[PDB]
Amino acid sequence: PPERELSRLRRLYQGHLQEESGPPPESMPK
Amino acid sequence: MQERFLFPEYILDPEPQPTREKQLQELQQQQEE
């Protein structure tokens, strides 16, 4: 997501936020 | 909209506590007779 939308979500859910997740691994790790 | 004038001298107030119970009692009576 663009950073502006992520900041919007952080304002909306301030105080109830988990660590942001990055893109998943390309394939299933073994 | 426009203002609708109401005139208290030409208005009749409502009667609370309507007693349909007596009507039902009359019905069950007449059945009993």
Binding site: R8, R11, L12 | E21, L24, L27, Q28
Partner: protein, 211 residues
């Protein structure tokens, strides 16, 4: 079958009691700000609303301080301001306050909706009038607030079918003799993704029953 008359009597008297004990907005939508509970029912508001309930204003808390209850004025919502960058507001056309309220801060309103810069044709009733969410657009700011340039809203007009449905459609075509190599497509320009926070029809909404 012995006719059940007491059932009819009970239904009629209950209906009469309901129609003669209809609660008003000032009672239904009052709130205790210390405990954040509705005194009418005793139910607590959801947690995610709590902050706004203590910070923002109901619509008629704003309109009762305006001449003619603010017909023609623009009102926006905090949630819209936080969610959307494009202007979202109601242009008020009719207001009917709850006269029993001490501060005339409850009631109903009608207006024309502009959502994300798109205005509607007609005026309809506003939902969430009792929410602590509303803001009044200053008159010296309206021109800056309403300024919107419609961006090109060019979205996808067709999508692929799911794999199995696509295979079945192609098989049916091939069985009926058609040898067309054109991919089957599903038309979605007619399906317009309506945002979940777009105002609903307040006319169709129900009301809390007195008790």
């Amino acid at each position: 079958v012995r006719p059940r008359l007491i059932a009819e009597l009970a239904r009629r008297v209950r209906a009469l009691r309901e129609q003669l004990n209809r609660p008003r907005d000032s009672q239904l939508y009052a709130v205790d700000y210390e405990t954040l509970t509705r005194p009418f029912s005793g139910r607590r508001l959801p947690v995610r609303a709590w902050a706004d309930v203590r910070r923002e204003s109901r619509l008629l808390q704003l309109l009762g301080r305006l001449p003619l209850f603010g017909l023609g004025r623009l009102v926006t919502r905090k949630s819209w301001l936080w969610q959307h960058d494009e202007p979202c507001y109601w242009r008020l056309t009719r207001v009917r306050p709850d006269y029993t309220a001490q501060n005339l801060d409850h009631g109903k309103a009608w207006g024309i909706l502009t959502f994300k810069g798109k205005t509607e044709s007609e005026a309809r009733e506003i939902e969430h009038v009792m929410y602590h969410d509303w803001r009044l657009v200053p008159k010296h700011e309206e021109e800056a607030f309403t300024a919107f340039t419609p961006a090109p809203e060019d979205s996808l007009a067709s999508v692929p079918y799911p794999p199995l449905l696509r295979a079945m459609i192609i098989a049916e075509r091939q069985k009926n003799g058609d040898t067309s190599t054109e991919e089957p497509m599903l038309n979605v320009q007619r399906i317009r993704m309506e945002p979940w926070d777009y105002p609903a029809k307040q006319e169709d909404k129900g009301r809390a029953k007195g008790t």
